[PDB]
């Protein structure tokens, strides 16, 4: 499993792979690990599939209910704070998950939350078994001045490196771009396939 989320000047880019291991061995090649949970909020999931899917449904209900009562979207920091409280409340019977939350309320944010509810903001973050390989790519190539197109290429390259070195990761790459002007936009598979050919990652 490899998930990545980065921040740009007015954009948030999130991308994951699709390989799912269940009862050992590769039993699913096209799993879903990137979810839209609000108008300008996305979440990626790593860890146990059962716990992660339950949390995704919980956040979708809470954020939609919050929107109807407050007539405004939940701020990204409030989204991470709410998740932090839920995970810490059952820390001794915990969800075995690692989560990334990203979006734009007035500025782009990416939050990393662990199983015990520890939440911390960062310009970029990666989770899963393939994350350390991604951090190597981001440490040497990430720049806050990149354009959206350049940022999409970077996350594709970083995940491609993880797929070469992490056996638990694989499959087709899913990419979502979040901006105020376009909202939550999931990039078509044909565009990403074109990008990998142009980038040289086969």
């Amino acid at each position: 499993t490899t998930t990545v989320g980065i921040t740009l000047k007015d954009a948030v880019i999130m991308a994951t792979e699709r390989r799912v291991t269940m009862e050992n061995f590769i039993m699913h090649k096209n799993g879903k690990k990137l979810f839209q949970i609000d108008t300008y909020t996305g979440m990626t999931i790593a860890g146990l599939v059962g716990d992660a899917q339950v949390l995704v449904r919980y956040m979708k209900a809470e954020l939609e209910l919050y929107r109807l009562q407050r007539r405004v979207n939940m701020p990204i920091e409030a989204v991470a704070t709410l998740l932090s409280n839920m995970l810490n409340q059952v820390k001794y019977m915990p969800y075995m998950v690692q989560l990334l939350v990203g979006g734009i309320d007035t500025a782009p944010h990416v939050f990393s939350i662990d199983a015990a509810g520890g939440s911390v903001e960062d310009i970029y973050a990666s989770t899963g078994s393939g994350s350390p390989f991604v951090y190597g790519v981001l440490e040497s190539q990430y720049s806050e001045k990149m354009t959206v197109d350049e940022g999409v290429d970077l996350v594709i390259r970083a995940i491609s490196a993880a797929k070469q070195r992490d056996s638990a990761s694989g499959g087709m790459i899913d990419v979502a771009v979040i901006t105020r002007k376009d909202g939550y936009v999931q990039l078509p598979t044909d565009q990403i396939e074109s990008r990998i050919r142009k980038l040289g990652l086969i």
Partner: protein
């Protein structure tokens, strides 16, 4: 006698407290909803009582979710409680099944909650009438709810003080499968027909939804070019 608490039947078999709660509904604001071609709309009358009131909290159409809206009449405090119950009930179904397939079941859960307040002593019934409209897997729907808990489906219906005047107008002029522009025009005419001789219609709130899309709340300028 048989008019105080609910858990008394009248000798001829009526619940007076339920009937008395219906009188409180007749003193509420007038609202209506109509079905049209591939959609359903909600119209609620908004009258102004003072220039010191912030015009925006007069929201009379409450969105239960992105695809279901409701309008209420009667006691506003009781209505707000029921609307909150509907919103939580809608999210529980989405958590359990991943989607909302039939709006009628959501309305039934609300109606069950009001029914228990007419059978168990120690409480009074809700003095609220509700109209539910939206799009589900079967298509556009339109429902009503009364203080007793009665549920009916309609092509067009109205609640409030002017319910009789609006319903009588729809009994004579309503047509099915109309365009949204035509249906809103008919709705305004129906609502106008209820205003006490002399009073002029004031900019109401209109919300409509079509199959495939989400609910859309009419802007005040778009409402203005309908009167």
């Amino acid at each position: 006698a048989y008019d105080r608490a609910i858990t008394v039947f009248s000798p001829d078999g009526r619940l007076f407290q339920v009937e008395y709660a219906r009188e409180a509904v007749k003193k509420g604001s007038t609202a209506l909803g109509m079905k049209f071609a591939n959609g359903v709309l909600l119209i609620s009358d908004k009258k102004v009582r003072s220039r010191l009131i912030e015009q925006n909290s007069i929201e009379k159409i409450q969105l239960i979710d992105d695809y279901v809206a409701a309008v209420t009449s009667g006691y506003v405090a009781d209505a707000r409680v029921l609307v909150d119950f509907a919103r939580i009930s809608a999210q529980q179904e989405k958590v359990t099944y991943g989607s909302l397939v039939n709006i009628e079941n959501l309305v039934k859960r609300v109606a069950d909650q009001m029914q228990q307040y007419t059978q168990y002593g120690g409480v009074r019934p809700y003095g609220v009438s509700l109209i539910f409209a939206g799009i589900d897997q079967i298509g556009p729907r339109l429902f009503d709810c009364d203080p007793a808990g009665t549920i009916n489906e309609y092509k067009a219906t109205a609640i409030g003080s002017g319910k009789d005047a609006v319903v009588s107008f729809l009994e004579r002029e309503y047509k099915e499968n109309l365009p949204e522009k035509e249906a809103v025009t008919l709705g305004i005419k129906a609502l106008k027909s209820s205003l006490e001789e002399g009073e002029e219609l004031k900019a109401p709130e209109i919300a409509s939804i079509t199959v495939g899309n989400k609910y859309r709340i009419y802007d005040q300028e778009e409402v203005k070019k309908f009167l």
